[PDB]
Amino acid sequence: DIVMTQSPDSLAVSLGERATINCRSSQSVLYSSNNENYLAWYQQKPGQPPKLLIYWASTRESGIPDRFSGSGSGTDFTLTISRLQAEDVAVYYCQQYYSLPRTFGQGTKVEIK
Amino acid sequence: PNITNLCPFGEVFNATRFASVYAWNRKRISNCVADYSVLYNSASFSTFKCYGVSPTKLNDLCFTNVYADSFVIRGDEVRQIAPGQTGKIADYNYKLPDDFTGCVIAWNSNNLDSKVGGNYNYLYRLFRKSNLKPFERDISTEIYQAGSTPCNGVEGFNCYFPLQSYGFQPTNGVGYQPYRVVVLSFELLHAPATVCGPKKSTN
Amino acid sequence: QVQLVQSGAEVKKPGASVQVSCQASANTFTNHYIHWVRQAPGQGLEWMGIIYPTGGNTIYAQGFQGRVTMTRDTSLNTIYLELSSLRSEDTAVYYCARDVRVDDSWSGYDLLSGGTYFDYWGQGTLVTVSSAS
Ligand SMILES: *[C@@H]1O[C@H](CO)[C@@H](O)[C@H](O)[C@H]1NC(C)=O
Ligand SMILES: *[C@@H]1O[C@H](CO)[C@@H](O)[C@H](O)[C@H]1NC(C)=O
C-alpha cells in the first residue's frame, strides 16, 4: 500500500554546506503516459503547518527561494538543500500522490553543525 | 408530458455481477429518455470525470447511442481509463480512443466485490502481442508466446498464461480496493436517434 | 490576510463526537478538492479522507472507514468531521489540506486522479482527549 520510509532518519548538517535527504518509495510512482514522477516535498516548522517546496519530482513551487532542489526518478529520490545558512531547521516530509491513501514519509529532522 | 421509458441504468450500475476487465461487457442503451442528473448528484460515485461534454450539459444534449462499457479495476488503475493514457489496463485490456466523449463513472465496491477471505474471480491480461486499438474487446485466452521457441500450447519457460488475478483483500488500502467502472461512450451516426435527456416540463 | 482558517481547538471525552472544521473562500475552492490530514505530536502525518466540496463525494482511509463521516455546506464551502469512538491514539492536529487539479481535459470530479499535491494547509486544530480535566 505504497508503504514508505526515508533512508536518513536524522542528519547533522554543517552550516553553509549541502545536505541530501534520500527518500525511497516501495512502489514506483512514475506514470508512463506523461512521465512525471509523482512526489512532493514538504517542511513543517514546530507548530506551523507543513509547506510544499517541490510539487512534481523536480520543479519548485512559486514563492519558495531557489535554495532547495530535488531530483530522481522511479523510486530513488533525493532532496538536496544547498548552503544551509538560514534557520531552516525543520522536519522534511516527502509523500506520494500517485495513489491513495497518500502515505507521507516518517519525516527526518535536520540539525545544524 | 413525461418520459416514455427510463433507460436501464439500474441494470448497469446496480448489476448483480460485473465482468472482469479483459471481458468487459457493453450495454447498448437505445431509444430511451436518460436521466443523468440522478447519477451526478449521487454521493456514492468516487469518480465521474466527464470528457468533452460537461456533466451538467448532458441533460439537454443528446446523441444516437450510449454504450455503458463496464468492468472492475483496482482504484489506482482508474486513471488509465481515459484518452491517451498508457499502462497495463490501457495497453492490454481496455484502450479508450484518443478522441473520446464519455464519462468514466466509478465507485468503491469493497463490500460487494470482496469478502473476508479475498476474491480471485477477477482477471486481467498481463501479456499480449501488441497494443489494443480503441474499443477492441479482445477476449483472447490462448497461451502467450514470449520468445522464438514454440510454447506447445502449454505453460513453461518463456510461456505465461496471459490472464492474472487481482486477488483483493479487505485489508488493502482504499486506493487498492475494487472500484467498479462505467464509461458511457457517446456516439453520433448518419441515422438520427434520441437517447436523450428528461422532459424538464414543470407542468 | 490569511485566506484559510480552521474552527479552533476542540476537546472531547472518549466515545464522544468532535466537529473539527474549516471554512474558506468559496470563490476559489469550488474547483479544488480538500483533504484531511492527521498528525500526532510524536508521530508523522496521517491520511483521513477527501471531500469534493460541492457534490460531497467522499473517500476515507481504510484505517478510519467506520469511524469518520464528513459533510459539506455549499453556501459556506466548509467541511466537517464526525470522528467518533475517540481514544488516546486520536490526540492529533487536523489540517484540511487543499489540492490543485492539474488537468483541464476532463470536467467533473475524480477523487482518485485529480488530487495532485497539497498546495495549501490550514492552521492546526489540536484535539486532546482525557478522562478528566
Ligand atoms: C409518461 O407519459 C405517457 C403519458 O403522456 C405515459 O407513458 C405515462 O402515463 C407517463 N408516465 C406516468 C408515470 O404516468
Ligand atoms: C441502486 O440501488 C439503490 C438502492 O436500491 C438506489 O438508491 C440507486 O438509485 C440504484 N442505482 C441507480 C442507478 O438507480
Numbering used by the authors:
A (entry chain B): 1 to 27, 27A, 27B, 27C, 27D, 27E, 27F, 28 to 107
B (entry chain A): 330 to 532
C (entry chain C): 1 to 52, 52A, 53 to 82, 82A, 82B, 82C, 83 to 100, 100A, ...
Kindly provide excerpts from the paper associated with this entry.
The target for nAbs against SARS-CoV-2 is the spike (S) protein on the virion surface. The SARS-CoV-2 S is a trimeric type I fusion protein cleaved by proteases into S1 and S2 domains. The receptor binding domain (RBD), located within the S1 domain of spike, engages the viral receptor ACE2 on target cells. The spike trimer has a dynamic structure, where the receptor binding domain can adopt various positions.
While RBD neutralizing antibodies such as DH1041 (RBD-1 community) or the RBD inner face Ab DH1047 (RBD-6/7 community), which spans across RBD-6 and 7 epitopes, bind to the up conformation of RBD, it is unknown if an S with RBDs usually in the down state would elicit RBD neutralizing antibody responses. Sarbecovirus cross-nAb DH1047 protects against bat coronavirus infection, but is unable to neutralize Omicron VOCs. The escape of the Omicron sublineage from the RBD-6/7 community antibody DH1047 raises the question of whether vaccination or infection can elicit a single antibody that simultaneously neutralizes multiple zoonotic SARS-related Sarbecoviruses as well as recent SARS-CoV-2 VOCs. Among the subset of 22 cross-reactive or SARS-CoV-2-specific vaccine-induced RBD mAbs tested, six antibodies blocked cross-nAbs DH1047 and DH1235 which bind to the inner face of the RBD and broadly neutralize Sarbecoviruses. Negative stain electron microscopy of the antibody-spike protein complexes confirmed that the cross-Sarbecovirus nAbs (DH1338, DH1337, DH1328) bound to the inner face of RBD similar to DH1047. Thus, NSEM analysis demonstrated that vaccine-induced inner face antibodies bound an epitope overlapping with RBD-6 and7 community epitopes just like human nAb, DH1047. Like DH1047, the epitope of DH1338 is on the RBD inner face and overlaps with the ACE2 binding site on the RBD. The RBD-epitope of DH1338 resembled that of S2X259, and overlapped with the DH1047 epitope, although DH1338 had a smaller binding footprint compared to DH1047. Like S2X259 and DH1047, DH1338 utilized its HCDR3 loop to contact the RBD β-2 strand. Hence, the non-stabilized S mRNA-LNP-vaccinated macaques elicited cross-nAbs that used different molecular interactions to bind to the same RBD epitope as DH1047.
